[PDB]
Amino acid sequence: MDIPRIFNITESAHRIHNPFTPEKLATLGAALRLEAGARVLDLGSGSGEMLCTWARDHGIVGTGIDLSQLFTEQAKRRAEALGVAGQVKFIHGDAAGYVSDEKVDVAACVGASWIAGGVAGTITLLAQSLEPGGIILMGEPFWRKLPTTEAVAKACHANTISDFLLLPEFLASFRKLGYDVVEMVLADQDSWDRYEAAKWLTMRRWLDANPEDELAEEVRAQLSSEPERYATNTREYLGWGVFALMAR
Amino acid sequence: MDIPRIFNITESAHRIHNPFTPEKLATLGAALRLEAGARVLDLGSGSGEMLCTWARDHGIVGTGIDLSQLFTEQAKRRAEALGVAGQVKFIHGDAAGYVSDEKVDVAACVGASWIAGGVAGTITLLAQSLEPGGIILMGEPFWRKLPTTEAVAKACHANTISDFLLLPEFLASFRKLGYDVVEMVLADQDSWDRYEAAKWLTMRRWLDANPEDELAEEVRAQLSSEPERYATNTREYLGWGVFALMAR
Amino acid sequence: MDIPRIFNITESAHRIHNPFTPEKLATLGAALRLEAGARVLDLGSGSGEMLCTWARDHGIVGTGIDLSQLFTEQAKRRAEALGVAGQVKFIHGDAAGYVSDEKVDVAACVGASWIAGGVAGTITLLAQSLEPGGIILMGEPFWRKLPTTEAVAKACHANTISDFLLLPEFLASFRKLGYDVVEMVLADQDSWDRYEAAKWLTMRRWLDANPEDELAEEVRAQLSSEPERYATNTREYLGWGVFALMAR
Amino acid sequence: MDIPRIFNITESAHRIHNPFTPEKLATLGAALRLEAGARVLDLGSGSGEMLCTWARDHGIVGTGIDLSQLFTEQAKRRAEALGVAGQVKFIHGDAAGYVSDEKVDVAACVGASWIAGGVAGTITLLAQSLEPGGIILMGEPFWRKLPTTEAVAKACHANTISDFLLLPEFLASFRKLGYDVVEMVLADQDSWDRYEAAKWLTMRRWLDANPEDELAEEVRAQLSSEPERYATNTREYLGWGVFALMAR
Amino acid sequence: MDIPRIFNITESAHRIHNPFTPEKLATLGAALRLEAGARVLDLGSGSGEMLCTWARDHGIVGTGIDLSQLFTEQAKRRAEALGVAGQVKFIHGDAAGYVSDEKVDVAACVGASWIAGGVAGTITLLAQSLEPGGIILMGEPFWRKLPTTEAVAKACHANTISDFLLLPEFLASFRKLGYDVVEMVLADQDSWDRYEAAKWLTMRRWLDANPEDELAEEVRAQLSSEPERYATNTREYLGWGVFALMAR
Amino acid sequence: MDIPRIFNITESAHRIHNPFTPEKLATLGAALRLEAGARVLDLGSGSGEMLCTWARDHGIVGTGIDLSQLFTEQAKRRAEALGVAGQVKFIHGDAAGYVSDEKVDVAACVGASWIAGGVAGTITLLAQSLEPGGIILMGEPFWRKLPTTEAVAKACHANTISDFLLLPEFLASFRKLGYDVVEMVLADQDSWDRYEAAKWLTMRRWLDANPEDELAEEVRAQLSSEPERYATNTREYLGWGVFALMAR
Ligand SMILES: Nc1ncnc2c1ncn2[C@@H]1O[C@H](CSCC[C@H](N)C(=O)O)[C@@H](O)[C@H]1O
Ligand SMILES: Nc1ncnc2c1ncn2[C@@H]1O[C@H](CSCC[C@H](N)C(=O)O)[C@@H](O)[C@H]1O
Ligand SMILES: Nc1ncnc2c1ncn2[C@@H]1O[C@H](CSCC[C@H](N)C(=O)O)[C@@H](O)[C@H]1O
Ligand SMILES: Nc1ncnc2c1ncn2[C@@H]1O[C@H](CSCC[C@H](N)C(=O)O)[C@@H](O)[C@H]1O
Ligand SMILES: Nc1ncnc2c1ncn2[C@@H]1O[C@H](CSCC[C@H](N)C(=O)O)[C@@H](O)[C@H]1O
Ligand SMILES: Nc1ncnc2c1ncn2[C@@H]1O[C@H](CSCC[C@H](N)C(=O)O)[C@@H](O)[C@H]1O
Ligand code: NA
Ligand code: NA
Ligand code: NA
Ligand code: NA
Ligand code: NA
Ligand code: NA
User: Which residues bind S-adenosyl-L-homocysteine (chains A, B, C, D, E, F) (predicted)?
Assistant: First the structure.
């Protein structure tokens, strides 16, 4: 099995499947003070950009599990291209209930927390793989500012305003779970632009090539509506970041 | 050991050590559809009013653990007075890490969640005592409305506004923990008045009797300031309720 | 025929199918100054709680018509349980166009006014059964405060904001129909909680028992979303009450 | 002498001539921790509901003075009906300057403070009857929220906004007089509804019976206008409560 | 009998006794798609401008009843002046309870609904004269925008804000009565100016001619105050229109 | 081919298929200073009211293309009725890509700009038919005021708020295209009422005649909801006008 086809089409040219730039991803690697040889587990690892670049830049080793066949293949090509295939392994499969045999120094789920039914569930899962004194990484949305209506929330892929919290309350929610927040690297509007806008070029080039595809009608509708939807709703209201956690 | 002396002085005449009336407490018992013989565990059971009245009215049995020696003694006198000592047992002691040998149908912590380091920790503790298909009860504050300043928060015994959530987000926080909210009974302003205002009469009568006590100066200052503090801050801004939870 | 199955599932454990507590229902009985022997007609009588309790407490007699087979059966069991079956009769059927042969002192429709196509139509219908000098009872929603968006209205089971009025304008609407408002008993937030929150426990227990039912998917979705929806929309914005009317 | 006829007509069926329910009145009795044998003086005692019910429920004894002949007669019938005539005495007369020979444990004026020219004057009067260590009870209005215009104030039976204070400032005003506030029981909107709405049924039934009375025109005008006036002005803006005071 | 003298003085030179221009009145005639021979009943027909002009322009026939002797005489002169006396009949008298013997295609009350005690009563009366498939016309005020204070309402000849509704809620009120709104023609500020400002010239010319009349003092006061009152209150806040209704 | 059936049903009795009165349409003709013999092309000409009335009043000649068979037939009957069939020709067909052989003095698209994929596309198309020094006419919506939510936009037949602009920005958009705005005639609320309200009478009369039509259910739902929807959304927020353009 796989993820739905439309995601593979829309994000086929993304290295990072989230609102983070390469510069943010490198900032995060350095913020974690990763040492050579550190072991990383990444559940929902996308196209392996985090593991591949940290292997290259910090000498880490690790494993990435992802449900997408396409993105798994990209991750493997990426590790070859960077010269780090010896350090990082990519597995195509479902990461639900995944627990590592050898403990890791960093256990991450960067924007895939439905794997264990939400943020708390995912933290509990990742904790099972974690070396005492290690770090858990959660990549998650929050309100950059509070939407004025529930409709802005539904245009940001939530059901209600209560699905997300403003940053102080979101940070508080990790504390209330039992964790210290020990680091964080947040998206800014420019990093959101990178994630969203790149989909538009990808979609248009796909559409030009696939005018009689069963999905061409749907894609054409998305391409038409997305820039304005994104600018009106997401760009102003939706925050995102990676939060580093250690259990008290 | 015990709780600090000032709490015993201020609340010596309270049956319910929270912003709930007798009528709210009975509403809660009926809302839970308690059957005769149902087993209840109550961590931080106060003066045993919940266990004693539900024993009388619904035929439940149970155990209440409380750190206060005074309130434990009151709970035992209450059970005798109601004719339910055969059904409900009160233990003087620290409820931290308390796990029941026999499972219970209802496992409760009504305004004492620091016992396991917060709401999530306490839910996890209570779950260890719970019969499959049972209910967890959490009695907790939330924002009735959002304070306009951090100072209102500090006047409501929080450190920051982020310590509490508005009701929709608070309900969402239980869902995000993995629980369905299956019932709730909330304080209203009248029930808050019962909890707070009763302290003033108690304090004044204590003060009249104990003019040379080491605490008389402190109590005199509290009595003077409390009604206005309460009316300005708590009465308008601070919500409270009991939430009934079942793990999904 | 019957009402849709989902209502029978959700409300199977409700005595009162509206945002009124037992205490509100008793307040209403006393507010009407009901005399022993007074005759009451109740169209859309639910589980007969109003007729049964007023029979017990005030010595009234009457008839309740309801389309639900389940709720009719409950009403009949309730009258037996209270010792008032001699005083109150429950009929399973459609109350549209129902006119009593003997006149009544109180003719009521408590939250079922679609029976005669709305509030005005229902008042006109009930008037046909009414003794000169009798009282008409209408149980109806109104805006507790004005929603800020049409979406809050649609989340409160209206189509538009104009479907309901703020209380002064709603009271004015009865006056403009030709009636004096002679009494009223309104829901508060606690009574709304009783009506809504009780559905959640009922639904969860049903779901646990009926995992392969054709409705399990729908019920699971409702249970997940309802507490937050209710707290965000209904609890703050939607009013409800019973209004007592006499024609000028 | 007597009170004006219109008040006797409008309130002839009220047990409590203020925005308090029976449940609030009983809450107040218990909040005061009244002991059997405690002596109560009630100036402007209405229909004696406070004295009669506290005699029945707490074993108090006392005296109620009221200017209304009707309400005095009702109070005497009430004490007989409850079996407490031996404990409570009702006197028809003017309570201005009334000082008790035997001291009392509770000296009350519940919504009649014009007797001594206002709140401060009335407190000073009641203090003359009070046992050292006793409680003074004042039943008084305040702003539940601040009216936006002087016209809302005049529709709430004040002359100006400055006639009343918001609750914190009102509580402060007792402190500034020299008293600790030691307890309080406040009206809510439901208790206001009980007080106001009951007048409408009373008025309509009176009007039906007295179509050619000199007051029928005035009463008809009041009945027409009151529900909307009440809902627009009083229900949202006007607070009321009973405050228990002890001199510092 | 007649209407009070001051109205006859103020409006003696008006053809249309409402905030409608001739152009609005003609728009309304065409909007109703009146056919030659259609029968119209007009209760409170003023100076007969609606009947006379529709007779001339659409070939309708009809009857107008008005309580003013003056305005009845004007209506009769108007029908002669337009050459339509054969088509339209004006009757001086009270239109309360008026029911036509022959049914009509259009039954109208344009700003005189106190005749049957309000909008609903008047609709019910007009319905008695109506051919199945005919139209009822109601000319009524509503809030163009919501006044900020009750005083603006009293300056617009209402008692309270709740006397009128904003247009969406007003339209909803007809729907809730059982009627489809099938057409409407609304006043604008210019049509209000025509109705109000014309009174000022009339009043001044009357005053110049009648300096010792018993009403000269009152008229002088009105003339002085009206333009500013009108501009401050009515022109911005008060809406008006004619609504065409058909029973569902 | 044709337009969908529902439009033909709803607008069968409209001469002007837009929020313009006859008086606005005549104002526009005079504003353009049309000379006898001037040639006009009208793409999406509706029922030909613009061409027919300008032929009659200004002596213009022209051609109207419309996709509706019904509205084309009406246009031809209209030209006969006005005595201008010699001057104006109506063609049933698709106006997309339509370019005139003889140049015209006025090239118009009045509320049909989807013909060339929007305002800019339509201007470019019309320009191909235009005599140097001629005028292009575009009939288009804009925001009369900015909706407070995207839902108001969707209730005004847009997808997002960004679909339309406030008038200054809308006028700027023509300037930014390369055109001077040389004249304009805008709808007001009364002209919107004419366009929308007339649909309600048409729909009701259709419904009365066609109770078993496949569309009766849909039409009944529209008739019920439209007046309130229109008053809440369109009447206050949606602007419309005809803008006269000359290329710089
Ligand atoms: N059950 C599952 N197990 C593993 N991966 C899953 C999954 N469900 C979804 N995914 C993957 O979760 C990812 C979410 S996008 C984030 C990917 C990556 N962390 C990055 O930032 O680039 C997708 O790559 C998708 O393929
Ligand atoms: N570590 C601990 N173990 C058990 N009880 C504790 C405790 N720390 C505080 N408490 C108790 O927690 C209670 C908080 S007040 C709430 C008490 C009770 N549930 C009621 O509603 O009336 C106090 O009674 C206090 O004695
Ligand atoms: N046409 C109809 N005739 C009679 N009852 C109807 C009906 N349509 C719906 N109902 C009933 O109307 C009720 C609405 S709920 C309110 C029920 C009751 N008055 C109470 O307050 O508890 C339901 O019990 C439903 O069964
Ligand atoms: N001068 C006076 N002396 C005694 N009673 C007076 C008075 N002037 C007014 N009253 C009484 O003051 C009362 C005010 S209403 C409040 C009555 C009562 N405390 C209750 O809550 O029900 C009326 O009963 C009226 O008769
Ligand atoms: N009881 C009654 N019966 C008939 N006409 C009445 C009436 N009471 C008032 N009127 C008339 O109602 C009218 C209100 S003014 C509106 C008049 C007319 N429809 C127009 O628009 O011009 C006045 O002409 C007044 O004379
Ligand atoms: N492709 C197309 N070619 C020509 N006319 C079209 C069209 N698509 C829609 N229309 C027409 O465009 C019109 C939009 S309504 C406006 C019509 C006219 N200008 C008036 O103001 O009255 C309708 O008459 C419809 O029939
Ligand atoms: Na940036
Ligand atoms: Na309350
Ligand atoms: Na309450
Ligand atoms: Na209440
Ligand atoms: Na105008
Ligand atoms: Na206008």
Answer: 17-18, 66, 94-95, 114
